[PDB]
Amino acid sequence: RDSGTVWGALGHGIDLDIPNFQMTDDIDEVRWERGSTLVAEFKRKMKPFLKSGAFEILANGDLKIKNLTRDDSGTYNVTVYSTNGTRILNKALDLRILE
């Protein structure tokens, strides 16, 4: 029920902040999924998945957008997993991009 909302502008930056989360050693897999597509998935076993240069996984397991766009407007979902491969934190935020 407590997802979250954010306001941004197309063509401008924006960082998707995960509520109550800390990308520390305890965190092994941080996936940034949106709808039926991937945006940025970081796995302790290196070899992550960056949708494109338009994104950058911050040091705190955050999402750094280069230039907002239509496809960027919507609800984002983060699934944080531990080193043991278990579910840690599952969040959902609302990223509204003003055109």
Rounded Cα gap, residues 95 and 10, in angstroms: 11
Nearer to Ca ion among residue 2 and residue 99 (C-beta): 2
| DSSP-derived 3-state class of residue 1 | coil
Q: Are strands 87-98 and 5-9 parallel, antiparallel or unpaired?
A: parallel
Tell whether residue 27 is a contact of Ca ion (CB under 5 A). Answer: no
**Shortest Å, Cβ 90 to Ca ion:** 17
Stretch that binds Ca ion, among 6-14, 17-25, 41-49, 78-86 (CB under 5 A): 17-25
Which position among 42, 62, 65, 80 is part of the footprint of Ca ion (CB under 5 A)? 62
Rounded Cα gap, residues 7 and 36, in angstroms: 22
Residues in touch with Ca ion (CB under 5 A):
15, 17, 58, 60, 62
